[PDB]
Design a protein around this ligand. Structure first.
Ligand SMILES: *C(/C=C\C/C=C\C/C=C\CCCC(=O)O)=C\C(=O)CCCCC
Ligand SMILES: *C(/C=C\C/C=C\C/C=C\CCCC(=O)O)=C\C(=O)CCCCC
Lengths: 263, 274
């Protein structure tokens, strides 16, 4: 079956690329410099952001003129809108995972409900380095020091991620690897309220086998990578529950009803 | 078949399984024999209520596991006090165990302490699974058995300390692990590398890297028909962190509701900044 574990890896990879525009391969090229030629607009401070508004014109999120006056908030609000796009990108990838659409409908919903955050932060790592994060289709780059530079909880929000991203990218995984890995996270059998755990585990098991092989063939060198990677799943839960803490803590900062409802 | 390389990992597994038995009086194998009734001499006194509770000291010898205290208006607290001191003991044991882990004492003195600082709880709840079943847990070295229900009816705060534990025991006990698997597993947990403060990480990782190898071989060798038990086992680590944290949160409250309740210094030197 070690040609069945290599077919499923490929399919996932091929789907991973068909559902996600900005890839680890890409994002990584940008960040550094390596043959690209069109540098990103660096948001490093106030005039940077405001100029970034009509440059990368990330006025997809920025509009809804009932803001503009509250930097820290228009930024976090930005992540909101962005994360929502990702979620649709994730759902689509989900349906690519063999067996996923065959499960009970409620379970797919539940699996996705409890997995997006973990999947968002994992990929968010591909788009950041020790000094900053890539924004809007990788057009820009929002420095890291500028994010702490935000007042209330708005400067503790991203910093945790940075610490995670650092440990995560240290694994030096690529898109081939992350595709399968993302699949594993989704097929989590301990999501509360599931209905039929057996099918899901059977799938995650097939995924775990595929992910192990992927790691061996792709990183003969790196020992027990498989293990080190599964362990990071712990860091995601924490990063997440924690992130979801501020979401509450930060309900004390005056912040259309349609839009709220869209989130 | 068996090769040079793999042979090194077998000696390692056997070395640790051997240190583990020598550091823990109540192995899982014994706990199970006690629990699954395969005995007429290993039967524990069951506690599911105050009367049973009262009878308890009147059977399951209690040299005051809940030291210095003829009593205390609350059983819930008297229990808590026992539970506390017991943990104090498990730390001591886990500690004797650690020292025997190849390379562990050869590390920076401070790191050794940070590994233990965080490793203790995670390890304590793993071992605590061994003493449980959906219905309760063993106490006093297997001599007694306190039901899940009793514990769950204790009182406002305290009636919330064990549930999360039973929660994990049921799922974890499902992997069907035995003492020899747990010894290597308990060893991996200690040799993390991402513990808050670890001055020198790398060396800690070369050790773990190896323990994982032992665990991987051990598991396959001991569960041939158990698909990805290795990975399924590693994921359970994420379950442990939550238990731990859920616990700390828990203590904190107690520290205000009951200003008369004391905590072991050692136990506090763990929690302080967790
Ligand atoms: C946003 C905060 C958390 C993560 C939310 C969304 C990230 C979404 C997708 C990751 C990339 C997936 C891919 O490459 O396809 C942090 C920010 O990025 C800052 C938002 C700034 C917007 C103005
Ligand atoms: C402690 C959980 C239960 C303790 C129950 C009753 C305590 C009363 C007497 C104990 C007798 C001594 C003995 O049990 O040997 C849960 C924890 O917080 C972690 C403890 C882990 C135990 C290994």
């Amino acid at each position: 079956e070690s040609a069945d574990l290599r077919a499923l890896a490929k399919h996932l990879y091929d789907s991973y690329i068909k559902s996600f525009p900005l890839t680890k391969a890409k994002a990584r090229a940008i960040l550094t410099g390596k043959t690209t030629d069109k540098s990103p607009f660096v948001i490093y401070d106030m005039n940077s952001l405001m100029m970034g508004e009509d440059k990368i014109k990330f006025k997809h999120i920025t509009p809804l003129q009932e803001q503009s006056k509250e930097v820290a908030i228009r930024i976090f609000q930005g992540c909101q809108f962005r994360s929502v796009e990702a979620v649709q990108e994730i759902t689509e990838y989900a349906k690519s995972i063999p067996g996923f659409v065959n499960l009970d409908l409620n379970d797919q919903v539940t699996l996705l409900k409890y997995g997006v955050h973990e999947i968002i932060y994992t990929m968010l790592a591909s788009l950041m380095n020790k000094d900053g994060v890539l924004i809007s289709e990788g057009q820009g780059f929002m420095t890291r020091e500028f994010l702490k530079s935000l007042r209330k909880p708005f400067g503790d929000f991203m910093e945790p991620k940075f610490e995670f991203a650092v440990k995560f990218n240290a694994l030096e995984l690529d898109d081939s690897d992350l595709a399968i890995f993302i699949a594993v996270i989704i097929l989590s059998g301990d999501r509360p309220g599931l209905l039929n755990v057996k099918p899901i585990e059977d799938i995650q098991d097939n995924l775990l086998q595929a992910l192990e092989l992927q790691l061996k063939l792709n990183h003969p060198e790196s020992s027990q990578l498989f293990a080190k990677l599964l362990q990071k799943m712990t860091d995601l839960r924490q990063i997440v529950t924690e992130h979801v803490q501020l979401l509450q803590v930060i309900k004390k900062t005056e912040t259309h009803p349609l839009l709220q409802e869209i989130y």
